[PDB]
Write an enzyme that holds these catalytic residues in place. Structure first.
Site, PDB file in Angstrom:
ATOM      1  N   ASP A  25      -0.214  -7.532   1.864  1.00 37.51           N
ATOM      2  CA  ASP A  25       0.309  -6.183   1.755  1.00 37.51           C
ATOM      3  C   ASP A  25       1.842  -6.207   1.738  1.00 37.51           C
ATOM      4  O   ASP A  25       2.502  -5.958   2.739  1.00 37.51           O
ATOM      5  CB  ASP A  25      -0.240  -5.332   2.897  1.00 37.51           C
ATOM      6  CG  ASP A  25       0.055  -3.855   2.787  1.00 37.51           C
ATOM      7  OD1 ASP A  25       0.480  -3.427   1.693  1.00 37.51           O
ATOM      8  OD2 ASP A  25      -0.183  -3.112   3.756  1.00 37.51           O
ATOM      9  N   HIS A  57       0.827  -1.211   0.000  1.00 35.22           N
ATOM     10  CA  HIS A  57       0.000   0.000   0.000  1.00 35.22           C
ATOM     11  C   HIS A  57       0.860   1.259   0.000  1.00 35.22           C
ATOM     12  O   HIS A  57       0.309   2.335  -0.169  1.00 35.22           O
ATOM     13  CB  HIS A  57      -0.971   0.002   1.205  1.00 35.22           C
ATOM     14  CG  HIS A  57      -0.426   0.469   2.496  1.00 35.22           C
ATOM     15  ND1 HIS A  57      -0.035  -0.456   3.469  1.00 35.22           N
ATOM     16  CD2 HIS A  57      -0.187   1.684   3.055  1.00 35.22           C
ATOM     17  CE1 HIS A  57       0.416   0.222   4.518  1.00 35.22           C
ATOM     18  NE2 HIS A  57       0.328   1.527   4.287  1.00 35.22           N
ATOM     19  N   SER A  79       4.232   3.121   7.528  1.00 29.46           N
ATOM     20  CA  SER A  79       3.821   2.063   6.642  1.00 29.46           C
ATOM     21  C   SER A  79       5.019   1.489   5.904  1.00 29.46           C
ATOM     22  O   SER A  79       5.849   2.292   5.494  1.00 29.46           O
ATOM     23  CB  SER A  79       2.928   2.639   5.520  1.00 29.46           C
ATOM     24  OG  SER A  79       1.685   3.045   5.941  1.00 29.46           O
TER      25      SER A  79
END
Ligand SMILES: CCN(C(=O)c1cc(C)cc(OC[C@H](C)Nc2ccncc2)c1)C(C)C
Ligand SMILES: [Ca+2]
Ligand code: NA
EC number: 3.4.21.5
Lengths: 28, 10, 252
Positions: C99, C43, C198
């Protein structure tokens, strides 16, 4: 081969300030 | 806010 | 990282900053797994609901850093991307299942006191360490609060959470390719990843062989350091066949 062994810590047998906290959580 | 990086990398 | 602390020099020598070329901004964290391969979250690179879809020439990776914003002359190394590989089954429509993404660098990075790869778990590693209560370490240069930005790399240690608690904390569907970590409200301690973190690594130090393993990748969360919410992490070992497939097919 030497993955995961930090030059400024494991390679010199020095511990960082909070890796003990991790070890203490690894109860087996 | 980010310091500029050298030319070589852009 | 919310409610963490400053990293020590060389504490996370596998830490990678994904840097947007223009405008110059932190995009995400990542990790170094060999002299030419960087691991991150899918992502960080692809998330259509937010109009995010980066290509190789949009980004750089910065390795060996400690300061967030400075160009750390003679210490950091900046690498270009040869190719991005996103998991073909990355489920961005629903819950970011799988992910994970790999980035191959154009040239090998020289290891140094500040730049060194992390290990990836094998089956036994995962079985031994990916247990509720066991703590890992998350690092990054993301936001300090849900609603500033740190001068230097931040670190926080967080326990792996029991899967039923993770499930009961959210309306999002959880998969076996995820785990969650964080303290419970009654535990009194705090900490989470946040915006900017992230793609960074969740690492654990094996007490068997003294080596650091990347067990997770910072994936999704609802807010940051909210009571009763937990951060979610991509389960690296569960995706290791894919990692190996890619590196074996495209590695040098
Ligand atoms: C709830 C719906 N989703 C997100 O809001 C979401 C979508 C994306 C693309 C990122 C994200 O969280 C990013 C955030 C920085 N990740 C954290 C991880 C651990 N702790 C806090 C934040 C959350 C996904 C699809 C489950
Ligand atoms: Ca639920
Ligand atoms: Na929380």
């Amino acid at each position: 081969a030497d993955c995961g062994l930090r030059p400024l810590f494991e390679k010199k047998s020095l511990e960082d300030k909070t890796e003990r906290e991790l070890l203490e959580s690894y109860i087996d | 806010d980010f310091e500029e990086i050298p030319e070589e990398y852009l | 990282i919310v409610e963490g602390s400053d990293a020590e020099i060389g504490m996370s020598p596998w830490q990678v900053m994904l840097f947007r070329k223009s405008p110059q901004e932190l995009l995400c964290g990542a990790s170094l797994i060999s002299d030419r391969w960087v691991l991150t979250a899918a992502h960080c690179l692809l998330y259509p609901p937010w109009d995010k879809n980066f290509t190789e020439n949009d980004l750089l990776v910065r390795i060996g850093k400690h300061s967030r914003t400075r160009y750390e002359r003679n210490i950091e190394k900046i690498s270009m991307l040869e190719k991005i590989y996103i998991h073909p089954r990355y489920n961005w429509r629903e819950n970011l299942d799988r992910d994970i993404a790999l980035m191959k660098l154009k040239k090998p990075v020289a290891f140094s006191d500040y730049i060194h790869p992390v290990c990836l778990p094998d089956r036994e590693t995962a079985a031994s360490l990916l247990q509720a209560g066991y703590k890992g370490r998350v690092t990054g240069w993301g936001n300090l609060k849900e609603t500033g930005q740190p001068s230097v790399l931040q670190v926080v240690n967080l326990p792996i959470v029991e899967r039923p608690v993770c499930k009961d904390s959210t309306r999002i569907r959880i998969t076996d390719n995820m785990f969650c970590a964080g303290y419970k409200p009654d535990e009194g301690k705090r900490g989470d990843a946040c915006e900017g973190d992230s793609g960074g690594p969740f690492v654990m130090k094996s007490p068997f062989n003294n080596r650091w393993y990347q067990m997770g990748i910072v994936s999704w969360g609802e807010g940051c350091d909210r009571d009763g919410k937990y951060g979610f992490y991509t389960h690296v070992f569960r995706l290791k066949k894919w990692i190996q497939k890619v590196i074996d097919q495209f590695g040098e």
